[PDB]
Amino acid sequence: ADWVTGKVTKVQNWTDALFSLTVHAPVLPFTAGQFTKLGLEIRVQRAYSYVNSPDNPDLEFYLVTVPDGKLSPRLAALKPGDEVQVVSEAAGFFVLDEVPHCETLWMLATGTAIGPYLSILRLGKDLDRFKNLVLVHAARYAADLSYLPLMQELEKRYEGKLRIQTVVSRETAAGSLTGRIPALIESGELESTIGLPMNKETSHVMLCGNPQMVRDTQQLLKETRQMTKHLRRRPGHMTAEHYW
Numbered sequence: 001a002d003w004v005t006g007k008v009t010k011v012q013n014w015t016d017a018l019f020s021l022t023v024h025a026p027v028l029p030f031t032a033g034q035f036t037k038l039g040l041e042i043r044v045q046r047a048y049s050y051v052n053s054p055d056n057p058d059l060e061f062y063l064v065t066v067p068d069g070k071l072s073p074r075l076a077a078l079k080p081g082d083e084v085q086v087v088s089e090a091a092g093f094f095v096l097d098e099v100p101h102c103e104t105l106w107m108l109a110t111g112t113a114i115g116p117y118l119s120i121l122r123l124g125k126d127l128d129r130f131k132n133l134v135l136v137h138a139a140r141y142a143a144d145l146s147y148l149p150l151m152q153e154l155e156k157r158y159e160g161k162l163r164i165q166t167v168v169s170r171e172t173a174a175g176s177l178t179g180r181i182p183a184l185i186e187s188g189e190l191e192s193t194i195g196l197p198m199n200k201e202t203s204h205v206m207l208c209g210n211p212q213m214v215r216d217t218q219q220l221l222k223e224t225r226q227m228t229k230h231l232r233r234r235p236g237h238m239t240a241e242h243y244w
């Protein structure tokens with residue numbers, strides 16, 4: 001991996017813990033859904049999904065400060081003009097190309113894991129093959145839904161093809177379902193609220209983020225919907241990308 005020097009052009013502090021960085025670095029083109037590594041000499045490096053469309057040079061990263069973590073608190077300290085090292089070649093297969101044909105593509109993410117979906121929907125290529133697109137972002141509190149405004153513009157842009165839903169687990173917030181993704185699927189509430197069923201006949205489900213959410217959802221979908229982990233060598237219905 002060859003590292004290049006990037007400059008933070010903008011810092012978006014959504015909450016005390018959530019922030020997005022916009023970086024100009026001479027990186028190579030990537031496929032929406034992919035990730036690169038960011039690093040600081042403390043060289044400590046971590047993977048971060050691109051949030052920007054691959055066609056937009058303002059690289060965007062959505063992060064959360066992990067208090068006891070080594071790199072996140074340092075990136076949280078960066079100010080515009082500061083340098084950060086970035087791997088120029090992207091990696092990752094959490095991309096449309098690896099997604100089978102299906103009538104409804106479900107994109108579920110917890111916390112900062114919504115980034116890859118946003119890159120994909122912002123670029124907006126190769127989506128004609130899906131009749132319905134569903135984007136679900138789950139967080140603890142409503143204040144944590146940093147990209148709700150973007151999701152709303154995207155929904156308008158897609159003229160009904162894309163349905164968006166936010167889920168919050170610790171409060172009641174107008175506009176969101178209260179709960180955890182696995183529970184809402186099981187109770188039929190997610191599908192009822194979104195207006196589309198999630199089954200092996202019509203759907204592919206993309207899961208990204210907290211590994212517990214991913215594992216729980218995958219186990220529930222396997223047991224109750226007979227859905228399976230998708231592999232190149234064994235096509236299925238679920239694609240996952242854990243952030244830890």
Ligand SMILES: Cc1cc2nc3c(=O)[nH]c(=O)nc-3n(C[C@H](O)[C@H](O)[C@H](O)COP(=O)(O)OP(=O)(O)OC[C@H]3O[C@@H](n4cnc5c(N)ncnc54)[C@H](O)[C@@H]3O)c2cc1C
Nearest residue numbers: 046047048049062063064066069070071072073112243244
């Ligand atoms: C493919 C991939 C893409 C990722 N993309 C992003 C991204 O865009 N944004 C981002 O915020 N993180 C992302 N991560 C997570 C990331 O690389 C880091 O682990 C991170 O920011 C925390 O690093 P640290 O050095 O602060 O923590 P570490 O000292 O390395 O400690 C990590 C611990 O912090 C917790 N943790 C790790 N990541 C998170 C997270 N996203 N949310 C809540 N808790 C976390 C976990 O419990 C993990 O056990 C990604 C990881 C992978 C594998």
